[model samples]
Target chain A: MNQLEMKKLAAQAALQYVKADRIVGVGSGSTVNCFIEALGTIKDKIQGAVAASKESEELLRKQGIEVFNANDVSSLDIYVDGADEINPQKMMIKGGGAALTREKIVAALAKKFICIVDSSKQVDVLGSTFPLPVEVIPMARSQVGRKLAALGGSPEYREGVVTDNGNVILDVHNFSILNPVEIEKELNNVAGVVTNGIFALRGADVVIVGTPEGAKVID
Target chain B: MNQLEMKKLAAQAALQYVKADRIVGVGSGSTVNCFIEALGTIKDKIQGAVAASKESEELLRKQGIEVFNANDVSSLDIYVDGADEINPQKMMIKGGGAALTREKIVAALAKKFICIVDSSKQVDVLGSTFPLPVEVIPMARSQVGRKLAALGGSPEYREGVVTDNGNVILDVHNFSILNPVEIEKELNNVAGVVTNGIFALRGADVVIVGTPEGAKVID
Candidate 1:
């Protein structure tokens, strides 16, 4: 099967964990989009889901799936999202669509955070395949860029694109994150940095990887 | 009163909350700067404060007030800061120095948030005397600005000044803030809005208003 077909099968495999008539948390990205589409097929079975982005919300709405806000929903039973890259510890770097901050918030709020990703996404460390996405306050961008550059990473501004929170996104290019937790913490400390798309410090509860064969659950 | 005298009085008023050997949480702005200098005098009695901005930290360090990071001190007894404008409930508008996001975070983490300001700051409603400062993601400036104008406020950029967080600030002019709580909620809903200076919804525990005569405590 092709990658898209494999993703669909994997998404279908993971759908069993989603309880009926409960508020669900949906994440952003292509694979997660596939999962949302699959979930849409069973729209009547589920109560509603909070989309991490407007794009996700629109897509889900088109599929006849009920959407909610994280604040509006009292409690979320499960959050099924996608990751950019996942390490052995299940720490991932997200924000391919700059929705990582909201995604993390929703996932953190949920009882279970189930990550759905393709096999290619699993890695030993972040920033190898994906540049760490740091959602920062736009005014602090240049100063933060200077700091990131001092740390030996090329910080580039993703112009004209804003996060769901309406902040700017900085992609810090290629650095072996010796200490993900420290870097994550420091990035947060940097003036204007709302959150970074580093999951190394925040270990995922569960990660479901999609392969050509099917989905494999990694605890 | 002279601006410097007003600032000094404001600072002295802020010092009311400081305790012996206790680490304090300091906010940003000219008024908070005054408080930092006042703490310098009682530096021996009070342990250093966690400054919200680098500027505040540098000033504190120069004044011989021991300055530290937010993570360094686990608990702050009380935070004596200043506000730009205060509402009937003593909710405040801060971040005149473009440190709204950081200042808000520090204030939120504090056990008690005490705001010290001049009588001029007190207002029946917010956005009358002071323009509401909305910190936004840079990319979403135009879009958010258009929306802010549509919401019946003359929105203007702070003119080439970027916040320490690399975000942009929108000065929403002359907002009569009918429902302060609802406005706060709606502003959060607006895309690209990081945080605004309007603190109407986020209740302040104590408000110390400094007049030429003395400081009056408003609960």
Candidate 2:
């Protein structure tokens, strides 16, 4: 199977955790799009969806899944999302599309975070494949960049892209994230940071890695 | 002197720290307005100003001091601001006006933070007088509020008030902020939190207290 097929397999695997007649916490990204498609097939089984981004919301609406405001929904059974990279520890790198804030928000409301991804995404350490994405305040981009640079990463501005919250993204490049939890804590403490892409603080509860053979579920 | 007079006294006293040919990081609120009024006298002496809010910028422009964008300025010599509450530890509860994120961004750029406040603002423990202000993503308000509520605070959504960053305010009340440094760190680590009012991480360098007598400058 191609990587796209692997992604579909993994996305399908996440469906087992979606509680029937309960509002689902939907995440963003390609694999999540696949999950949404799968959810569409069982649209009558689930109550509705709380999407992490406008893109995901639109897709959910198109699937005839009634979208919910995250504020209105107190909690969810699961948040099935995709990751840029995942480690054996279940720590992951996210927000390649700059939707980390919303993804994390929706994920926080869920009791279980089911990270669905292709087998190739599994890595020994985070940030080997993906440059860590940090959603930053526009005015603090340079300052946050300097702080991130101080931590031995090349912080680059993702030009012309503003988040739904009207902020900028700083993709810190070329650093092997040796310790994700510490790095996440440090990034979280930075002033003017809306949210960083690091998921170590509240990493995946389950990782379903799709291989050519089938979906390999890891708790 | 009344509290307003005392506030003006402290505001005027902060002017002594404003170096000539330097860009001052201006903060928001009533006392800072008094400081901006003081800064107006020596507006020609300073290179320019970086305001923490549109209100401060308006005041700066009205005083004919060219307002520089916070992003463009590499660093600032000093930040003159007011506070809601200040402990003996110098840790503060600011952002009563819901401008904490911008205030913090500009403050981070400064070499020093000169906090000008009336004596009434002083407290034995932070949050004793002021409800701690937290700027939260609109979606994560309840989630964050629940977390703060878990920490023994009554996190009330500051009604109809949106921050400069287009986020909501949750003024956490009734909790005596005992260990401010730890609380600030914990609050910083919260997902979807733009910035909290707690200033323990980067507390004031010089706290100038305006009394009935005169300005009491603490080094």
Candidate 3:
């Protein structure tokens, strides 16, 4: 099967965890798009969904899934999302779509985080292949870039791209993150940083990987 | 001298640090207003300024001082701002005006931070008289508030106020912050937190206190 087909298999497998009459927390990305499509098949089974980005919200709406504001809901049963790279420990590096801030927020509100990915996304360590994305306050771009550079990564501005929160993204290149949690803490503490792409502290509760054979579930 | 007079005294005292031929980082608040008025006198001496808020930018423009975007300026000679509560350690709890995120960003780029405040704003401990403001992703308000409450704070949502970055403010009340740096680091690690009000990580380089006698400088 192609990677897209594997993603569809993994997305469909996540549907078993979606409880009826509970608000679902939805994440963004291609795999998540498949999940939203799967969610449409059981639209009446769930209460509604809280989306992490406008793109996801629009898709969910088009799929006839009820969309609710994240503010109105206090908690969620499960959050199904996709990551750029996820490790064996279930830690992930997200924000490739610039939705890291909202994605992290929605994931935090959920009781369980179910990460769906194709085989290629699994890695031994985070940040090796993926340049870590750091959402920053626009005015603090250069200063934050210097700080990231001090941390042994060459920071590059993703020009002409602004986050949903009206911030900028700094893609830190060429740094092998030894400790994901430690580096995540350090980046978040930097002034003007809206959110870092690291999801180590609140890593995935379950990872559903799609291979050519079938969906492999890991907890 | 009254409190306002003392604030003016301290604000005017901050003028001595503004050197020629460099962009100054300007902050927000009443004490900062006095600083802007003082800046008007030496408008021609400095190159320009980068304001941390719309109010400061308006005042600087009215004074015929050029206001540059924070992204355009790489480094600033000094950042002059005010605090809601400042301790002897020079640590502070700001964001009383919901401008903490921008203020913190501007302060990070400056070579030195000069804090101007009246004697009444001084405290024995941070978060005693003033609540610590935390800027959060709108979706994670309740979740973050629960976490703040777990940390022994009464988190109250600042009603009808949205930050420039399209986030909400949660003023954590009655949090007797014993260790400013530790709590600052802890809050920053929170998933949805955009920026916290604690300035201990990058506290003031110089604190100019307005007193009945005169402006007392602390370094």
In order, what DockQ does each candidate have? 0.06, 0.85, 0.78
Docking class of 2: high
Interface Cα root-mean-square deviation for all models: 11.3, 1.0, 1.4
Model 3: per-residue lDDT, tens digit, B1-219?
789999999999999999997889999989999999999999999998999899899999999999999889778889999999999889999999889999999998899999999999999989999999999888788889999999999999999999877889999998999999999999888878888999999999999999999999997
Ranking by lDDT: 3, 2, 1
Compose the digit string of candidate 3's lDDT tens values, residues A23-45: 99999999999999999999999
Local lDDT at B217 for model 3: 96
- Give the poorly placed runs of model 1, Cα more than 4 Å off: B1-5, B8-99, B102-219
Least lDDT summed over 10 consecutive residues: which range in candidate 2 chain A? Answer: A186-195
Candidate with best TM-score: 2
Question: Which tens-of-lDDT digit does each residue in A1-219 have in candidate 1?
Answer: 577776676677769888988877888888888988899888898888887778899999999887876646545788888888888878788888789767766665567778887788888867888888888655456656767888889988998988776678889887767677677655644544667888655567788877876788876
By DockQ, rank the candidates, best first: 2, 3, 1
How far residue B177's Cα lies from its native spot in candidate 3, in Å, is 1.1
TM-score of every prediction relative to native: 0.58, 0.99, 0.98
Minimum summed lDDT over a 10-residue window in model 1 chain B is located at B185-194
What is the TM-score (0 to 1) of candidate 1?
A: 0.58
